[PDB]
Design a protein around this motif. Structure first.
Motif, PDB file in Angstrom:
ATOM      1  N   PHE A   1       0.854  -1.215   0.000  1.00  0.00           N
ATOM      2  CA  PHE A   1       0.000   0.000   0.000  1.00  0.00           C
ATOM      3  C   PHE A   1       0.878   1.249   0.000  1.00  0.00           C
ATOM      4  CE2 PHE A   1      -2.302  -3.357   2.137  1.00  0.00           C
ATOM      5  CZ  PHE A   1      -3.502  -3.372   1.466  1.00  0.00           C
ATOM      6  N   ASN A   2       0.674   2.092  -1.020  1.00  0.00           N
ATOM      7  CA  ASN A   2       1.509   3.288  -1.294  1.00  0.00           C
ATOM      8  C   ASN A   2       0.825   4.540  -0.734  1.00  0.00           C
ATOM      9  OD1 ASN A   2       1.968   1.252  -3.906  1.00  0.00           O
ATOM     10  ND2 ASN A   2       3.778   1.896  -2.795  1.00  0.00           N
ATOM     11  N   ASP A   3       1.515   5.222   0.173  1.00  0.00           N
ATOM     12  CA  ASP A   3       1.229   6.620   0.580  1.00  0.00           C
ATOM     13  C   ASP A   3      -0.183   6.725   1.161  1.00  0.00           C
ATOM     14  OD1 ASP A   3       3.799   7.849  -0.034  1.00  0.00           O
ATOM     15  OD2 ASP A   3       3.280   7.288  -2.149  1.00  0.00           O
ATOM     16  N   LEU A   4      -0.587   5.766   1.990  1.00  0.00           N
ATOM     17  CA  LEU A   4      -1.897   5.824   2.688  1.00  0.00           C
ATOM     18  C   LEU A   4      -1.884   6.984   3.685  1.00  0.00           C
ATOM     19  CD1 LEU A   4      -3.040   2.149   3.284  1.00  0.00           C
ATOM     20  CD2 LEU A   4      -3.124   3.592   1.282  1.00  0.00           C
ATOM     21  N   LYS A   5      -3.000   7.698   3.799  1.00  0.00           N
ATOM     22  CA  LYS A   5      -3.260   8.626   4.928  1.00  0.00           C
ATOM     23  C   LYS A   5      -3.493   7.773   6.181  1.00  0.00           C
ATOM     24  CE  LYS A   5      -4.786  12.348   1.947  1.00  0.00           C
ATOM     25  NZ  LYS A   5      -5.764  13.367   1.512  1.00  0.00           N
ATOM     26  N   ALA A   6      -3.443   8.389   7.356  1.00  0.00           N
ATOM     27  CA  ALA A   6      -3.492   7.680   8.647  1.00  0.00           C
ATOM     28  C   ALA A   6      -4.786   6.865   8.710  1.00  0.00           C
ATOM     29  CB  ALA A   6      -3.370   8.663   9.773  1.00  0.00           C
ATOM     30  N   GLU A   7      -5.925   7.457   8.356  1.00  0.00           N
ATOM     31  CA  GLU A   7      -7.225   6.738   8.431  1.00  0.00           C
ATOM     32  C   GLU A   7      -7.165   5.493   7.550  1.00  0.00           C
ATOM     33  OE1 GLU A   7     -11.036   9.454   9.705  1.00  0.00           O
ATOM     34  OE2 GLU A   7     -10.231   9.723   7.693  1.00  0.00           O
ATOM     35  N   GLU A   8      -6.693   5.621   6.311  1.00  0.00           N
ATOM     36  CA  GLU A   8      -6.686   4.496   5.336  1.00  0.00           C
ATOM     37  C   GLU A   8      -5.793   3.388   5.892  1.00  0.00           C
ATOM     38  OE1 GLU A   8      -5.494   7.271   1.945  1.00  0.00           O
ATOM     39  OE2 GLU A   8      -6.923   5.953   0.891  1.00  0.00           O
ATOM     40  N   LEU A   9      -4.660   3.759   6.492  1.00  0.00           N
ATOM     41  CA  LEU A   9      -3.653   2.795   7.007  1.00  0.00           C
ATOM     42  C   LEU A   9      -4.261   2.031   8.180  1.00  0.00           C
ATOM     43  CD1 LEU A   9       0.145   3.391   7.279  1.00  0.00           C
ATOM     44  CD2 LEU A   9      -1.063   1.936   8.886  1.00  0.00           C
ATOM     45  N   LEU A  10      -4.818   2.752   9.153  1.00  0.00           N
ATOM     46  CA  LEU A  10      -5.425   2.113  10.338  1.00  0.00           C
ATOM     47  C   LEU A  10      -6.548   1.172   9.886  1.00  0.00           C
ATOM     48  CD1 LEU A  10      -5.331   5.122  12.795  1.00  0.00           C
ATOM     49  CD2 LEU A  10      -4.201   2.911  13.065  1.00  0.00           C
ATOM     50  N   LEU A  11      -7.412   1.584   8.952  1.00  0.00           N
ATOM     51  CA  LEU A  11      -8.475   0.692   8.421  1.00  0.00           C
ATOM     52  C   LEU A  11      -7.827  -0.548   7.811  1.00  0.00           C
ATOM     53  CD1 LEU A  11     -10.924   3.302   6.922  1.00  0.00           C
ATOM     54  CD2 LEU A  11     -11.516   1.531   8.605  1.00  0.00           C
ATOM     55  N   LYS A  12      -6.804  -0.394   6.971  1.00  0.00           N
ATOM     56  CA  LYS A  12      -6.259  -1.569   6.254  1.00  0.00           C
ATOM     57  C   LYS A  12      -5.678  -2.533   7.291  1.00  0.00           C
ATOM     58  CE  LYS A  12      -6.975  -1.236   2.604  1.00  0.00           C
ATOM     59  NZ  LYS A  12      -8.352  -1.461   2.095  1.00  0.00           N
ATOM     60  N   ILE A  13      -4.957  -2.024   8.277  1.00  0.00           N
ATOM     61  CA  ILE A  13      -4.209  -2.914   9.205  1.00  0.00           C
ATOM     62  C   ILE A  13      -5.210  -3.518  10.199  1.00  0.00           C
ATOM     63  CG2 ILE A  13      -3.503  -1.100  10.814  1.00  0.00           C
ATOM     64  CD1 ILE A  13      -0.694  -2.541  10.731  1.00  0.00           C
ATOM     65  N   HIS A  14      -6.241  -2.772  10.586  1.00  0.00           N
ATOM     66  CA  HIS A  14      -7.316  -3.272  11.483  1.00  0.00           C
ATOM     67  C   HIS A  14      -8.107  -4.371  10.761  1.00  0.00           C
ATOM     68  CE1 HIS A  14     -11.109  -3.554  13.581  1.00  0.00           C
ATOM     69  NE2 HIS A  14     -10.470  -3.106  14.681  1.00  0.00           N
ATOM     70  N   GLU A  15      -8.472  -4.146   9.502  1.00  0.00           N
ATOM     71  CA  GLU A  15      -9.066  -5.168   8.599  1.00  0.00           C
ATOM     72  C   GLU A  15      -8.238  -6.450   8.726  1.00  0.00           C
ATOM     73  OE1 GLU A  15      -9.444  -3.576   4.696  1.00  0.00           O
ATOM     74  OE2 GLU A  15     -10.056  -5.497   3.763  1.00  0.00           O
ATOM     75  N   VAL A  16      -6.941  -6.377   8.458  1.00  0.00           N
ATOM     76  CA  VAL A  16      -6.055  -7.573   8.417  1.00  0.00           C
ATOM     77  C   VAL A  16      -5.991  -8.201   9.816  1.00  0.00           C
ATOM     78  CG1 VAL A  16      -3.616  -8.281   8.129  1.00  0.00           C
ATOM     79  CG2 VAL A  16      -4.742  -6.885   6.373  1.00  0.00           C
ATOM     80  N   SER A  17      -6.141  -7.407  10.870  1.00  0.00           N
ATOM     81  CA  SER A  17      -6.033  -7.930  12.253  1.00  0.00           C
ATOM     82  C   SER A  17      -7.267  -8.790  12.594  1.00  0.00           C
ATOM     83  CB  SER A  17      -5.773  -6.809  13.246  1.00  0.00           C
ATOM     84  OG  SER A  17      -6.967  -6.266  13.777  1.00  0.00           O
ATOM     85  N   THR A  18      -8.440  -8.473  12.026  1.00  0.00           N
ATOM     86  CA  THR A  18      -9.756  -9.042  12.445  1.00  0.00           C
ATOM     87  C   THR A  18     -10.210 -10.169  11.504  1.00  0.00           C
ATOM     88  OG1 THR A  18     -10.991  -7.385  11.267  1.00  0.00           O
ATOM     89  CG2 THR A  18     -10.491  -6.904  13.592  1.00  0.00           C
ATOM     90  N   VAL A  19      -9.647 -10.260  10.312  1.00  0.00           N
ATOM     91  CA  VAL A  19      -9.729 -11.486   9.475  1.00  0.00           C
ATOM     92  C   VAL A  19      -9.076 -12.652  10.248  1.00  0.00           C
ATOM     93  CG1 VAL A  19      -7.986 -12.183   7.720  1.00  0.00           C
ATOM     94  CG2 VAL A  19     -10.144 -11.110   7.031  1.00  0.00           C
ATOM     95  N   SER A  20      -9.399 -13.896   9.886  1.00  0.00           N
ATOM     96  CA  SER A  20      -8.823 -15.136  10.472  1.00  0.00           C
ATOM     97  C   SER A  20      -7.446 -15.410   9.869  1.00  0.00           C
ATOM     98  CB  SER A  20      -9.712 -16.320  10.244  1.00  0.00           C
ATOM     99  OG  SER A  20      -9.216 -17.460  10.925  1.00  0.00           O
TER     100      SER A  20
END
Ligand SMILES: Oc1cc(F)ccc1CNc1ncccc1-c1ncon1
Lengths: 251, 251
Positions: free
Chosen positions: A59-78
């Motif tokens: 992921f290239n040049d995400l703003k803070a909101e986009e980054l937290l969403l992407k990493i939180h997404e990956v944390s809550t998947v199995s």
């Protein structure tokens, strides 16, 4: 029946996800320089982690909101059917913080999402963060930044990997990329599939420390040595032996 | 001739010095509790490091001046005929600081004395600090302190070893001593002379993390887990294979 040579179980269906957050440019009002070369780091990492069985997601040049969403997404998947998790930050940093495009994020809150309590499917599996971040100083030149990011631990079964330690300097070639990543990726290529990962990180410590900084095209970059480190909270030996992907579904 | 299995040269005449600074009591006006059990840690460490060939030198309840003199003395003597250096702190701490009897000392200035530039006879040899320090909370009871000491790196060829990481808790039995040291010393006994030292420290991470904190005599000590870590700036594999002390002067 306590075993001195106990290995993490690395025989799950898939190896797991490798996140790469790749930051080249920043919001004007942060006054942080471009990281010309970071794309070489991203591509070299993508290749080396792919060959070890990782589903690499950049992921290239995400703003803070986009980054937290992407990493939180990956944390809550199995991750139940995965060996481990890797997350890489290629940006600027200061203290506890990594820089998104628009603001700093607290490293603890990114590692926090994968702590035992919050991500059950990764409990007892290795969680590996690699961090190529330092202070924005402001064809193929070598740019040099001061170490800035604390070499923090995380929790049980995390391995935090840092380009540079307190009092040393981090180097990025503008075409070839960061010294740390060049040597990390070289060692992953030669030895990823055989060596215990901390033995490998130790080779990266040697490779980067041994790079000479006595005859430089910029006078002021002389004697600016680079020593990386890692903080291991691992509890077992960690190997990336080739997975048996013959007549099996690994998607 | 680059070698993935390269070992530190551990074939010098003597193994080297193991400093132990051991702090049980503190100046009244610091309001820090006694560390009942620290003497067990000191004696257990003394034994285990002796059996690996170390000249162990312990010092009880030094004031800051006495401590700085002793460690500066050891820094400026020759280690030319030594494999490595070990320094252990059994005290209270906060952030960058360890407590002497009378005041805090900056950890960086203790590790600084052994940095390549300042101690030529230790350049390219392992420098290992072990730190059993945490916040003074204020027959064989288990006392429990909050982690307080930053898990700092040092420079090239240092290994910083910490009883406890940010957000976890450090345990001391008042007769048997600190959990970290008990398990470190047990592993040194069984495996010191065979295992690579970081593989061993990883076993200590497992042993301490696996200690149960669910049924405790004090209710408020429940769910207070302990995870140690290490920060490795080492550049080679580190072994304490038995030295050949037959028909040779090793004093
Ligand atoms: O590694 C470093 C890099 C630097 F550029 C500056 C200082 C350090 C060492 N400090 C720490 N090391 C490990 C975990 C936490 C800390 C820390 N420091 C303040 O608050 N927490």
């Amino acid at each position: 029946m306590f075993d001195p040579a106990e290995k993490y179980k690395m025989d799950h269906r898939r190896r797991g996800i490798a996140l790469i957050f790749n930051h080249e440019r920043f919001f004007w009002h942060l006054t942080l320089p471009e990281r010309r070369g970071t794309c070489a780091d991203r591509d070299n990492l993508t290749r080396r982690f792919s060959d070890l069985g990782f589903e690499v997601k950049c992921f290239n040049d995400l703003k803070a909101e986009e980054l937290l969403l992407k990493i939180h997404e990956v944390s809550t998947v199995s991750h139940a059917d995965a060996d481990c998790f890797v997350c890489v930050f290629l940006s600027h940093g200061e203290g506890n913080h990594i820089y998104a495009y628009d603001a700093k994020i607290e490293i603890q809150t990114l590692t926090g999402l994968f702590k035992g309590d919050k991500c059950h499917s990764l409990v007892g599996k290795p969680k590996i963060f690699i961090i190529q971040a330092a202070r924005g100083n402001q064809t193929n030149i070598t740019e040099v930044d001061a170490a800035s990011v604390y070499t923090l631990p995380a929790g049980a079964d995390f391995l935090m990997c840092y380009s540079v330690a307190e009092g040393y300097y981090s180097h990025r070639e503008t075409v070839n990329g960061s010294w740390y990543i060049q040597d990390l990726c070289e060692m992953l290529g030669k030895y990823g599939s055989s060596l215990e990962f901390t033995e490998l990180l130790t080779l990266v410590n040697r490779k980067v420390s041994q790079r000479r900084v006595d005859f430089c095209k910029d006078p002021s970059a002389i004697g600016k040595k680079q020593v990386p480190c890692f903080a291991s909270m691992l509890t077992k030996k960690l190997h990336f032996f080739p997975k048996s992907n013959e007549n099996l579904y690994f998607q």
